[PDB]
Design a protein around this ligand. Structure first.
Ligand SMILES: CC(=O)N[C@@H]1[C@@H](O)[C@@H](O)[C@@H](COS(=O)(=O)O)O[C@H]1O
Ligand SMILES: [Ca+2]
Length: 480
C-alpha cells in the first residue's frame, strides 16, 4: 500500500521500568516485548508532562500544554480544553484522507463553557476536533461520571434518570466514601472519598444515569472490543486510531482472568491485562493482514505511581519490582521518571528492528507524521512540533536539540545533550498525597544524565555558566 494505517496507544501511568523489554524482571510483558522486537524501542523518549491531560493535549495539538492555563488534570465534567479552531493531529490526518477514531480514555474535556451536560448531545466533543468516531471514558476511571460517551451521547442513559455531576459539593443522595465507609470495597489511601460506584469511592459527586454506569472489571474488554470494531470497520481504508487504555491507572480492577496472576497485587495484574490488550490489537491486525503497512506506536501519557489513592497493597506487593527503573521521581515529578516513558514504533514494511537512543519528545509526533504524509500545516498549526521522522522510524540517531518536561506544579525542566536543568519553583518539594519527590526547589538543579542518570548529584554550584545558558534557553522556548 501507499499510505500506512496509524494506531497511537497511550497506556496510563506505565513506567519506563514496568515492561520486561525495558528490563523488568518481576513482571513479564511478552506481547509488548514482541512489539518491541518487531520495531524500534526508544530509551530516551519523553512525554511533555508528568500528568495525563497536559501530555495528551501536547500530543494532539503539537503545542506545549503549559502555554494554556486550563490544561492541568481535568475533572470528569471539564468543558473541552482544545479550542475547536485549533488544528489537531486528527484534523491533519483527516485532511490527509484517513478515517479517524478515538477509543478509551479522553481526559481533554467535553461540552462548552460551564462544564459537561451529560444528558443530551454533548458538543463540542472529540468529533469537533477531527475524530469521525468517539467512544470514550470522560476523564479517569477514578473520576465521575463513571459512564461511556459514544459520538456525543452517554451509552445506556435513561432521560427519566438524568445525570448531574459536581466537583465542588455533593449533588443527590448517593453513598460516599466519607459518609458510607460500610459500602466501600476498595478503601481510599488519599482522598477518593466522594460518590461510590460498584463499591469504589470516586473523585467528585454524581447522581442519575444508573443504567449507564460501567462495570470496572469489564473496561479493558470494552475498550479492546471497540478498538477492534473500529479496525474491522476500516479494513479497506486508511485509518487513524487514537487509543487510551485505563490500565495501569487507579482504581486497578483486573478482569477475573488476570486477577492474582502477577503476584504484584492489582497493579501487576493490570500490567498483564494491558499486555493482553496490546496482544489483541496485534492479533486483529495479523488476522486482517494489516500488520505490515500499519504504524503502531505504543507509549504512556506520564511516568508511574505505586500508591495513587487506594489501599490496593501496590507497595506491599511490589516484590522488588522497579516501575521507575533506575530513575528518580515518578508521576507528578520533574525528575526523569515523571516524563521518561516506554515508546515503541512498529511499521514492518518500512522499519527494521532497532533501539533508538536519540532524544525524542511526543511533541514532535504531529509534525513527524505530517512530514511522512507530505501534508501541509496551517502557519499556526502544531507550533512546538519539529519534524523528526527519521528519528521516529529509527532511520537516524539524531537527538532533538533539547526536550522540555513539565511537572504537576508547571515547573519546567530542559534536557540538552548530557545536561538536565530544573528551573527554580516555590511549589512544595514533596507531593502532599503520594509524598512523590516533585523536583520543586527554590534553587536551580543541574544533573549530568551521562554520568548521573538517577539525578543523585545536583552540580548547579559547579557549573553556573551551564545553568545560565540552559536557563536562557528554557526562557526563550517559553516566550517564543
Ligand atoms: C488524591 C487524588 O485525588 N489523587 C488523584 C490520582 O488518583 C489521579 O486520579 C490523578 C490523575 O492522574 S492522571 O494520570 O489522569 O493525571 O489525579 C490525582 O488528583
Ligand atoms: Ca496518567
Amino acid at each position: 500500500s501507499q499510505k500506512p494505517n496509524i494506531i497511537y496507544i497511550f497506556a496510563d501511568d506505565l513506567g519506563i521500568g514496568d515492561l520486561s523489554c525495558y528490563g523488568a524482571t518481576k513482571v513479564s510483558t511478552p506481547h509488548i516485548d514482541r512489539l518491541a522486537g518487531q520495531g524500534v524501542q526508544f530509551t530516551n523518549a519523553y512525554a511533555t508532562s508528568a500528568t495525563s491531560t497536559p501530555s495528551r493535549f501536547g500530543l494532539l495539538t503539537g503545542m506545549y500544554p503549559w502555554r494554556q492555563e486550563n490544561t492541568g488534570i481535568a475533572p470528569g465534567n471539564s468543558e473541552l480544553i482544545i479550542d475547536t479552531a485549533c488544528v489537531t493531529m486528527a484534523d491533519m490526518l483527516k485532511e490527509a484522507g484517513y478515517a479517524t477514531g478515538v477509543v478509551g480514555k479522553w481526559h481533554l474535556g467535553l461540552g462548552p463553557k460551564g462544564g459537561t451536560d451529560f444528558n443530551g448531545h454533548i458538543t463540542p466533543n472529540a468529533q469537533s476536533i477531527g475524530f469521525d468516531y468517539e467512544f470514550v471514558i470522560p476523564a479517569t476511571v477514578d473520576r465521575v461520571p463513571c459512564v461511556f460517551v459514544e459520538n456525543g451521547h452517554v451509552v445506556g442513559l435513561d432521560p427519566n434518570d438524568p445525570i448531574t455531576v459536581n466537583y465542588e459539593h455533593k449533588v443527590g443522595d448517593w453513598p460516599t466514601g466519607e459518609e458510607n465507609p460500610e459500602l466501600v470495597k476498595l478503601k481510599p489511601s488519599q482522598g477518593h472519598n466522594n460518590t461510590i460506584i460498584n463499591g469504589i469511592p470516586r473523585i467528585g459527586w454524581m447522581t442519575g444515569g444508573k443504567s449507564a454506569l460501567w462495570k470496572d472489571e469489564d473496561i479493558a474488554d470494552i475498550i479492546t472490543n471497540k478498538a477492534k470494531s473500529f479496525i474491522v470497520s476500516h479494513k479497506e481504508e486508511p485509518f487513524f486510531l487514537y487509543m487510551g487504555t485505563q490500565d495501569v491507572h487507579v482504581p486497578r480492577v483486573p478482569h477475573p482472568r488476570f486477577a492474582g496472576k502477577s503476584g504484584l497485587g492489582t497493579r501487576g495484574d493490570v500490567i498483564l491485562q494491558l499486555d493482553w490488550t496490546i496482544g489483541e490489537i496485534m492479533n486483529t491486525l495479523d488476522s486482517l493482514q494489516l500488520t505490515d503497512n500499519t504504524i503502531l506506536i505504543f507509549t504512556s501519557d506520564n511516568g508511574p505511581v505505586i500508591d495513587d489513592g487506594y489501599q490496593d497493597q501496590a507497595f506491599e506487593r511490589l516484590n522488588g519490582h522497579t516501575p521507575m527503573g533506575i530513575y528518580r521521581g515518578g508521576k507528578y515529578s520533574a525528575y526523569e521518571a515523571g516524563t521518561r516513558i516506554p515508546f515503541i514504533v512498529r511499521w514492518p514494511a518500512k522499519v527494521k528492528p532497532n533501539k533508538q537512543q536519540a532524544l525524542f519528545s511526543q511533541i514532535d509526533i504531529f509534525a513527524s507524521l505530517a512530514a511522512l504524509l507530505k501534508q501541509p500545516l496551517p502557519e499556526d498549526a502544531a507550533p512546538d512540533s519539529q519534524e523528526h521522522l527519521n528519528t521516529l522510524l529509527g532511520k537516524d540517531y539524531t537527538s532533538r536539540e533539547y526536550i522540555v518536561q513539565q511537572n504537576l506544579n508547571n515547573t519546567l525542566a530542559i534536557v540538552k545533550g548530557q545536561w538536565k536543568y530544573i528551573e527554580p519553583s516555590d511549589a512544595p518539594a514533596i507531593e502532599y498525597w503520594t509524598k512523590m519527590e516533585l523536583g520543586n526547589d527554590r534553587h536551580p538543579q543541574l544533573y549530568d544524565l551521562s554520568a548521573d542518570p538517577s539525578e543523585k548529584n545536583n552540580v548547579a554550584k559547579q557549573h553556573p555558566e551551564v545553568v545560565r545558558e540552559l536557563s536562557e534557553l528554557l526562557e526563550s522556548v517559553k516566550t517564543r
